[PDB]
Amino acid sequence: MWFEILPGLAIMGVCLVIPGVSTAYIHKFTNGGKEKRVARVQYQWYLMERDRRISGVNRYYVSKGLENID
Amino acid sequence: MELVEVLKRGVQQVTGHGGLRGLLRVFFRANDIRIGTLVGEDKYGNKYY
Amino acid sequence: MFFINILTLLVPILIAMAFLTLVERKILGYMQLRKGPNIVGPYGILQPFADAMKLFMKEPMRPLTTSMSLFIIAPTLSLTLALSLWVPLPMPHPLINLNLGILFILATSSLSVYSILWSGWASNSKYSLFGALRAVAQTISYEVTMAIILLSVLLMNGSYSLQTLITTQEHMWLLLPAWPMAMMWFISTLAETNRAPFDLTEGESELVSGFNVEYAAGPFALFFMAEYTNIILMNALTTIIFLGPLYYINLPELYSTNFMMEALLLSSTFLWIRASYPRFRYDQLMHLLWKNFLPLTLALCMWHISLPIFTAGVPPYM
Amino acid sequence: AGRISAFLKNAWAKEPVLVVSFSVWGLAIIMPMISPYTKYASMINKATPYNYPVPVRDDGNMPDVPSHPQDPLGPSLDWLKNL
Amino acid sequence: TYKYVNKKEQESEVDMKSATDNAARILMWTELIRGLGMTLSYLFREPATINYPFEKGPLSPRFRGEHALRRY
Amino acid sequence: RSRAEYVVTKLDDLINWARRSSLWPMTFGLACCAVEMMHMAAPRYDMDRFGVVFRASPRQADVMIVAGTLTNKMAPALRKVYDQMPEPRYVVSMGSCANGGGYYHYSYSVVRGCDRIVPVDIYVPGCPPTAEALLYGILQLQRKIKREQKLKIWYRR
Amino acid sequence: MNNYIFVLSSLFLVGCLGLALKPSPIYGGLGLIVSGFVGCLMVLGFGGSFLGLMVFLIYLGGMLVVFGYTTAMATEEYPETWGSNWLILGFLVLGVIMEVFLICVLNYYDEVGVINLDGLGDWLMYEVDDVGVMLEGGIGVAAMYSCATWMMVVAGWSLFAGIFIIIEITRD
Amino acid sequence: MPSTFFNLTMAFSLSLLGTLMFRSHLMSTLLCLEGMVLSLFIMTSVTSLNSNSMSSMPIPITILVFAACEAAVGLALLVKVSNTYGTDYVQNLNLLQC
Amino acid sequence: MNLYTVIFINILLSLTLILVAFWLPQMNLYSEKANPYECGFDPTSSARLPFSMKFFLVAITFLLFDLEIALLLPLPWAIQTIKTSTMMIMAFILVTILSLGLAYEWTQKGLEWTE
Numbered sequence A: 001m002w003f004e005i006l007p008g009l010a011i012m013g014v015c016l017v018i019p020g021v022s023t024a025y026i027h028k029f030t031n032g033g034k035e036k037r038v039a040r041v042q043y044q045w046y047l048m049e050r051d052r053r054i055s056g057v058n059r060y061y062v063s064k065g066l067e068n069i070d
Numbered sequence B: 001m002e003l004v005e006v007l008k009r010g011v012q013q014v015t016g017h018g019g020l021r022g023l024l025r026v027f028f029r030a031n032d033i034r035i036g037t038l039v040g041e042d043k044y045g046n047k048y049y
Numbered sequence C: 001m002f003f004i005n006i007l008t009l010l011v012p013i014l015i016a017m018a019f020l021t022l023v024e025r026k027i028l029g030y031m032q033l034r035k036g037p038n039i040v041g042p043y044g045i046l047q048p049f050a051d052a053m054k055l056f057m058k059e060p061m062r063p064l065t066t067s068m069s070l071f072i073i074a075p076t077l078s079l080t081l082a083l084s085l086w087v088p089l090p091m092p093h094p095l096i097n098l099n100l101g102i103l104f105i106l107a108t109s110s111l112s113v114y115s116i117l118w119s120g121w122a123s124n125s126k127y128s129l130f131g132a133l134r135a136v137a138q139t140i141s142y143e144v145t146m147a148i149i150l151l152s153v154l155l156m157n158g159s160y161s162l163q164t165l166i167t168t169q170e171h172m173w174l175l176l177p178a179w180p181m182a183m184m185w186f187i188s189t190l191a192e193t194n195r196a197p198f199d200l201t202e203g204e205s206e207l208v209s210g211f212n213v214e215y216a217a218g219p220f221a222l223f224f225m226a227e228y229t230n231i232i233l234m235n236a237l238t239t240i241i242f243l244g245p246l247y248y249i250n251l252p253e254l255y256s257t258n259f260m261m262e263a264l265l266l267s268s269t270f271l272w273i274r275a276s277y278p279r280f281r282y283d284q285l286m287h288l289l290w291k292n293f294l295p296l297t298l299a300l301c302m303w304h305i306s307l308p309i310f311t312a313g314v315p316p317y318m
Numbered sequence D: 001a002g003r004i005s006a007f008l009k010n011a012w013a014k015e016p017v018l019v020v021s022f023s024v025w026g027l028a029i030i031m032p033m034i035s036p037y038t039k040y041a042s043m044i045n046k047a048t049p050y051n052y053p054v055p056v057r058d059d060g061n062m063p064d065v066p067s068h069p070q071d072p073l074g075p076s077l078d079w080l081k082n083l
Numbered sequence E: 001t002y003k004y005v006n007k008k009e010q011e012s013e014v015d016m017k018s019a020t021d022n023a024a025r026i027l028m029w030t031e032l033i034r035g036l037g038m039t040l041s042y043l044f045r046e047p048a049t050i051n052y053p054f055e056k057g058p059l060s061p062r063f064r065g066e067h068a069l070r071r072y
Numbered sequence F: 001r002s003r004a005e006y007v008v009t010k011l012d013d014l015i016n017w018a019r020r021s022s023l024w025p026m027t028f029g030l031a032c033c034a035v036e037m038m039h040m041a042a043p044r045y046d047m048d049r050f051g052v053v054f055r056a057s058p059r060q061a062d063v064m065i066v067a068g069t070l071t072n073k074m075a076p077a078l079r080k081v082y083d084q085m086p087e088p089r090y091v092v093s094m095g096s097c098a099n100g101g102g103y104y105h106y107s108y109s110v111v112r113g114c115d116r117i118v119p120v121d122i123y124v125p126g127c128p129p130t131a132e133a134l135l136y137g138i139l140q141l142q143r144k145i146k147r148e149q150k151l152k153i154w155y156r157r
Numbered sequence G: 001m002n003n004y005i006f007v008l009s010s011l012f013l014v015g016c017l018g019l020a021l022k023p024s025p026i027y028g029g030l031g032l033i034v035s036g037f038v039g040c041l042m043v044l045g046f047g048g049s050f051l052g053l054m055v056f057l058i059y060l061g062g063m064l065v066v067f068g069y070t071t072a073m074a075t076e077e078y079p080e081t082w083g084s085n086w087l088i089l090g091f092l093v094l095g096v097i098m099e100v101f102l103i104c105v106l107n108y109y110d111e112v113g114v115i116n117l118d119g120l121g122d123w124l125m126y127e128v129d130d131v132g133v134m135l136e137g138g139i140g141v142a143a144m145y146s147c148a149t150w151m152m153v154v155a156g157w158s159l160f161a162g163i164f165i166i167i168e169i170t171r172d
Numbered sequence H: 001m002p003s004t005f006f007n008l009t010m011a012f013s014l015s016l017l018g019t020l021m022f023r024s025h026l027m028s029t030l031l032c033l034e035g036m037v038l039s040l041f042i043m044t045s046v047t048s049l050n051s052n053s054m055s056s057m058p059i060p061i062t063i064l065v066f067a068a069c070e071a072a073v074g075l076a077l078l079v080k081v082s083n084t085y086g087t088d089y090v091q092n093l094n095l096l097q098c
Numbered sequence I: 001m002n003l004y005t006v007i008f009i010n011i012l013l014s015l016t017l018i019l020v021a022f023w024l025p026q027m028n029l030y031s032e033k034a035n036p037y038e039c040g041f042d043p044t045s046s047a048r049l050p051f052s053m054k055f056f057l058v059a060i061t062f063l064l065f066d067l068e069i070a071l072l073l074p075l076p077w078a079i080q081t082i083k084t085s086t087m088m089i090m091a092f093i094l095v096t097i098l099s100l101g102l103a104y105e106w107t108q109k110g111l112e113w114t115e
């Protein structure tokens, strides 16, 4: 009947939810619990490079708050 | 409703072929899990429903 | 980790393509009062793997009249451009984040048309030549109309990125403001993907097989994979652009699930349309896209030029 | 005229795509000339601060420019906030 | 006797409602939508496919198959 | 036996499974037998359910179902489209005409069986054989190419 | 990652060399497509993506029409590629050798003239606004709508008159 | 930038050399013209991007527009030539010497 | 770098697929196997012969229209301008001129195919 299509539909559904979910999780894992920063303009790229220099570990995603200020 | 009745027919089709092994046997040999009245069985072992 | 991201994008897209072939067989069968494949595997789920293995263990054809270099180059080009078009889509986060995403999409689609053209010319056969020329006419018509459609839609959106489209459809689908050009975009995607009634290049009844009539086994498999990956691709692009899935900052899994459901619905609509309609004649396709779609597309482009100006709803740059 | 209306109805019956296209063209032409929000688009684009506001040297002769951003003087965007 | 399959009798004239109906038919693809609906109905029907070789198509005693020589 | 012999046998089983689960016939027919062939394509029997799908070009075909009377004027064309099929190819003669000439055996313009022109793998008898009989022949061909031992013969070489 | 632009420029030179050597127009259009893609990559590396993607799309449409035309009327029974003639293939390899010889001569004799291998990859991006919005290349082409309306109208009249011109030429 | 600009200038020189050295195919001559056009576009675009001349960035698009009009008219003339002779041969286009 | 990497991965994957497709199965090719396909008979003439094009005028028009598309494409950045009246007027003029050209060609039967 018409519900025999549903196994192939479910396989397609799993194979379509895997790329987006995995991409979001990989971005979060590689940026340390935060989303991957988007530098659409030179100002945002400069912010990312300033964060990378500020962190002292050459990783922009290691943010420094008020613990660096006396 | 009728959806639960369809699910009842489905679960009896699943648990109507003996066991899990019998269900897998009929599903991978005949590609069909319908339950029918056993009309007979011949001398060679073919079952007729 | 980026290579693992490449793998977890590429491999599930390929498996979804193969099960799209299976689900096309099942849906077409059930619309044709039959069942479709349910023997090879539990419910037919091993049928695409059987077909892939058979095609990759059948010998390829190298005809005497055929230009070998372009004959080899065309199918691998087609598959690479299909996966490249897949790469920048956000669900809701793209693997490759671009600024001019739809321009990348348009360039890669036209290069896929070139893959079809070079296959048809390299396979030195008259039916292949027919398929190449029909591809030329088809891509002329849908290229001009689809470019104007996408221009109007992104004029409503404000930028060429696609995360911007997610932010645009945060509150409402673009189907409600832009449903006529949504219909014209859907027809344009059908013609772009060469699906019935606008296939006209793998003409089963008019030609024999058209542009890939001399292709066998492996390269034919590459062409089929490229085409069906493009089907899922264009339906995914349609649901990203027009039917905006629910996006929440705290969880993107809801966006991925809604995107998957809408993309599956649009792909099933493609199979439904192939079942329902007879094939166009390829001059009638050009006459349609140049006499009905194009004047209305120009009018709606002017309307979407005017609309943010007199409503003060000019979209943000970022 | 009656013949004009009959021709328009015939066009709407047989070739509605061209009628819709011409109507949308005309509406896009005439709509910004009658809408009251048309000036607001240019004003919003002017108010969008893509560049840094370079301060001017105060010689004590211009009283209109504000000394501080949180001053009553200057181009406030209350119209945009309440838009 | 005979009948016409495509000849139209008289004319329906021109009306605003009829013109709008034809315009909606052309623009909104109404016959295409109802063709889609017909295919959808067939999708939700039950297929006519038997499970060969476990199910065989019906025959009659008159059926002419493989030859044989009989006995008393 | 040797461990590698078992691996070769399993690889043979895998290849034969793929080739018998994916059998694409050429869209080729000649007569009333081809009418019964599209009645096999019809929703009752569903060759597509069995995995059998027509392809128009002989390059994408795996099997050739000779369904009809092979005439003298047709024989070069039939040989041509058979030769243009790629190597793992099979031939199913269908009906008395393609088998041994049939009702036109003593005709001046009829090839007395398509086995004079192409090597036939499976003969399906009838005039016409029913779509049941043609489907039976297709399944018998699937069993026949399941019986193939190509890698095992290559290993034993 | 320093000689990437130089590699692209060399590939563009090779594609233009093949186009100059004039194979069958199918292969000429193929070489022009590859050259357009390479030029798009060069504009991408040097700056804004919009100009490169624009010339890529324009040349994709153009060589599509060119492919249709050369299958229509500019074709022959045996199309001529770069390898079908010994003279054309010899000119191809001789042009490659001459390119290598010329870049070596400009590297050694002329020192820092047009080509410097030590200085290669150092003078690609001269000055960039490190902090700044509204810097991409498409904004100038957008400023054609406002700053250069004369440019807009001459381009539009060129296309309009071109439609009339092609209709009158192919009127027959 | 200077090595890239020299390579682009040599690419234009090769395309001009191809245009000036005819073979039998007028379509190939038009392709050489389009290659000259492409080299001009890339030179103008990299010059504008190097000098940050966003005011002069409409110039490459204008070049593309007028050059595509040129290519369109060339294709129309090639259509007329092929209708006259059956081929696009510049050796057939020779009867105006007398 | 990442985009270049994934493009190269796609190239490698497709080259690997076509390479295994050409070197995995058994080869048996002869003259009739590799002769071109003409539905069972020999081709009367080569397929490299001239093949008439009935939409050549539409193709030239497509070139001009594609350049009109290239002109219209900087609109999403053009709508951010201060002088929106000039941009709106210029865009209206461009689209109206394009539409008038299309209408003139439709009137002069340029969209219709020859013969």
Ligand SMILES: COC1=C(OC)C(=O)C(C/C=C(\C)CC/C=C(\C)CC/C=C(\C)CC/C=C(/C)CC/C=C(/C)CC/C=C(\C)CC/C=C(\C)CC/C=C(\C)CC/C=C(/C)CCC=C(C)C)=C(C)C1=O
Binding pocket: C014, C015, C018, C021, C025, C028, C048, C049, C051, C052, C053, C055, C221, C222, C224, C225, F026, F027, F028, F029, F030, F031, F032, F034, F035, F037, F038, F041, F048, F053, F054
């Ligand atoms: C009365 O007079 C007469 C006629 O007049 C009417 C005649 O006509 C006539 C001639 C008669 C005939 C020739 C009979 C022919 C019969 C018919 C015309 C009727 C049959 C009907 C049709 C053909 C219509 C069928 C319609 C359909 C919708 C069916 C679908 C068919 C398709 C072709 C589309 C589906 C595609 C396929 C089956 C192939 C798809 C699959 C692949 C190519 C696989 C690709 C996948 C991969 C390569 C993926 C690989 C990648 C991975 C990652 C996989 C991972 C793998 C692992 C191993 C892990 C005669 C003689 C005649 O007398």
Ligand SMILES: CCCCCCCCCCCCCCCCCC(=O)OC[C@H](COP(=O)([O-])OCC[N+](C)(C)C)OC(=O)CCCCCCCCCCCCCCCCC
Binding pocket: C175, C180, C182, C183, C184, C186, C187, C197, C238, C242, C273, C277, C288, C291, C292, C293, C296, D015, D017, D020, D023, D024, E026, E027, E028, E029, E032, E033
């Ligand atoms: C992605 C979102 C969903 C998209 C739709 C998906 C579901 C539906 C899919 C249906 C199946 C399609 C299969 C392919 C069909 C191909 C045929 C086809 O579509 O032909 C196109 C047909 C062509 O019709 P035709 O060709 O029959 O007409 C004859 C025309 N001549 C004589 C010139 C040849 O229709 C169109 O071109 C219409 C396009 C859409 C128009 C929408 C207009 C909406 C209203 C606008 C505003 C009106 C008011 C204005 C203001 C007034 C103020 C007072």
Ligand SMILES: CCCCCCCCCCCCCCCCCC(=O)OC[C@H](COP(=O)(O)OCCN)OC(=O)CCCCCCCCCCCCCCCCC
Binding pocket: A039, A040, C076, C077, C080, C081, C084, C097, C098, C099, C100, C104, C107, C108, C111, G040, G041, G044, G049, I001, I003, I004, I007, I008, I011
């Ligand atoms: C079989 C042969 C096939 C040959 C054809 C290959 C086609 C590949 C797929 C289609 C490509 C279409 C053209 C794409 C051009 C780049 C598109 C683009 O917009 O790139 C810009 C992007 C980043 O720019 P932007 O979006 O502005 O972001 C800045 C802030 N994030 O990204 C960048 O700036 C990155 C710049 C490089 C991107 C392209 C990389 C191409 C790699 C080479 C492929 C061919 C290799 C040679 C052949 C190998 C052997 C066959």
Ligand code: SF4
Binding pocket: F031, F032, F033, F034, F067, F068, F069, F094, F095, F096, F097, F098, F102, F103, F126, F127, F128, F129
């Ligand atoms: S065997 Fe009988 S049914 Fe079949 S083709 Fe011959 S005459 Fe027709």
